[PDB]
Symmetry: D2
Subunit: 142 residues, 4 copies
């Protein structure tokens, strides 16, 4: 809703932000438009793996929530549902501390699938990882 | 804690504090060619819509495939890290557990590849992850 | 139809097998069931790149045609259309000569998307490449 | 022929005989960080249903990203080969041309990554390919 600043498209949500994975690791959406969205997270141990680096899953999740929610922002009101269907994240350079900043750019908005390219950077602006997200858009059963 | 491979004397982050320990991932079996892990679904593993977070599946696969590689290569002076993770989602999971099984399909000198299958309590294939693990010589 | 032994689901096809990319490089389907299909191709220069190895695109194409056609075999008659939506091929070992043998195993058959894992092997049975194929199934406009 | 980088005295397969030369791929621009190529749609590039073969897009991207890497690294004693190719299809192409543009996003010591965009004659994004290129020291 606003806990992590996610899009307010519903009156009630099944799980409260603070309690979700997102709330737990502290993902926060910064900008959000139909074609582009941004989010970030402060690196803490909760975001890392045992070796001291940001967990690969963390980048995937950030990209996942971002691209999906960005789709949700537009289609919800149109009676649709949006869920992640494919997430392909590639790791270029590890992140040990600071933040992870994600930028999602929409590259295709089909009737059934939206596609977003997500770039994940470190505090120095280096490209640490990228995620190609494919979002399925379907009519709500609800 | 998570039953991760014990390959070193000290780890920078304690299990309980890692993302793995936070969501509750636990390794069940581990061999050079195959490994398994699972996690109980809690809200910590879900997104606001009540379903298991796509990131959760990615994370499980990533840790499982990477650690299964570390298990073999660590003792050989090598480091193993995730290079690519491609997860595809077939059916959501609302509660119960997520169980992963990683099958090694290629063990190259510089890259290992694992196919990970993620299933629900009914044994249904909910998602798959194709994991590419980079293997490199440890730096001083 | 049978030129490359593709599934006979229509009376007429827009392009004749021998003239398509498939016919050109010589892809031939061997077995074909709803859950699993196989195909092969003899390596010739037409399948290679300038460095003398089987072109990465060749593996992608073989996987692509196979997984799609295998879906087509079942859904066509059901009034659907099937096209490749995502193809992720990973290369483990190059192939210089002989054949490339592909085996597609269906792992998920949703209402809108089917997913097949394709393994591409050399004459010695080695796993040279794999392709994760996502096939979109939609109702024919035709 | 295809305007591929001239980096060596002899090539095992002549351009015209390769898959590239057979379908008609031609490199247009090439720099270390970006390259372009295109091809005229012919039946040789299509599948039986009359659309450009998904494999055609994969192939174009693969050759373009790989050769753009070879262009830089060959002279450095390295070999470049495709390691992973992930192509996603957004809109089919029935005739005309397919134009590709490869943008380098990471140039690591062992892996280079390129984003390839494939467009039709109307400039519409028909498909994308995420190419991972392995860079290794040449073998004797
Ligand atoms: C995959 C998908 C159907 C998904 O639909 P979407 O992402 O939601 O996009 P959307 O529904 O908004 O429509 C996009 C365009 O797709 C096409 N399309 C979508 N639905 C349909 C349909 N039911 N019937 C025909 N065309 C359709 C159409 O061109 C449409 O544009 P428009 O007519 O609406 O202006 C669409 O993105 C698409 O068609 N991508 C192109 C797929 C493609 O060309 N794959 C490669 C060729 S097929 C695989 C292959 O290589 C092969 C080789 C040999 C062989 O024997 C068989 C197959
Ligand atoms: C990518 C990689 C180098 C990664 O190495 P890895 O996963 O750690 O595996 P590993 O290093 O243990 O070696 C596996 C095999 O790869 C080959 N290989 C690995 N490193 C090397 C090297 N430095 N030099 C030569 N061969 C090598 C070799 O065949 C080796 O087998 P072996 O002789 O050691 O028994 C290896 O898996 C591989 O070579 N995969 C095959 C790559 C391939 O064939 N891609 C498609 C063709 S190249 C892309 C293309 O389509 C293209 C098209 C047109 C054009 O103009 C240019 C390019
Ligand atoms: C993607 C897709 C909709 C494609 O449909 P399909 O491949 O053709 O399969 P099919 O239509 O036959 O149905 C499969 C199952 O999907 C579900 N499903 C399909 N269509 C719908 C729909 N319109 N409404 C609800 N559930 C549906 C349902 O569980 C269905 O089973 P059943 O009720 O028919 O027995 C389906 O495969 C699926 O739902 N996969 C699971 C998607 C998923 O769980 N992604 C991860 C969670 S959402 C992304 C995320 O992490 C996130 C995080 C934070 C945040 O704030 C927002 C999002
Ligand atoms: C994959 C690869 C090693 C490939 O190397 P490359 O593409 O050729 O790039 P390059 O070799 O030039 O080096 C780039 C950076 O990678 C790092 N790196 C590369 N090789 C090494 C090495 N042998 N030792 C240490 N760092 C290295 C290093 O940070 C380097 O920067 P620099 O110090 O040289 O300036 C590099 O891109 C990389 O390290 N990517 C980051 C990998 C990553 O962070 N994956 C996610 C975390 S590990 C997977 C995971 O989530 C997990 C979770 C739980 C668990 O229990 C275990 C694992
Ligand atoms: Cl929120
Ligand atoms: Cl767009
Ligand atoms: Cl542990
Ligand atoms: Cl293996
Ligand atoms: Cl045929
Ligand atoms: Cl199945
Ligand atoms: Cl040439
Ligand atoms: Cl770059």
């Amino acid at each position: 809703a606003t806990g992590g600043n996610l899009p307010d498209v519903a009156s009630h949500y099944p799980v409260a932000y603070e309690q979700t994975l997102d709330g737990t690791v502290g993902f926060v959406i910064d900008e959000m438009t139909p074609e582009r969205a941004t989010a970030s997270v402060e690196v803490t141990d909760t975001l890392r793996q045992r070796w001291g680096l940001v967990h690969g899953g963390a980048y995937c999740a950030l990209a996942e929530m971002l691209a999906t929610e960005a789709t949700v922002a537009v289609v919800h009101e149109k009676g649709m549902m949006a869920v992640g269907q494919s997430n392909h994240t590639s790791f270029f350079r590890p992140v040990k501390e600071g933040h992870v900043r994600a930028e999602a750019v929409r590259i295709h908005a089909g009737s059934t699938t939206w596609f977003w390219d997500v770039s994940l950077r470190d505090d120095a602006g280096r490209l640490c990882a990228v995620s190609s997200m494919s979002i399925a858009v379907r009519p709500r059963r609800d």
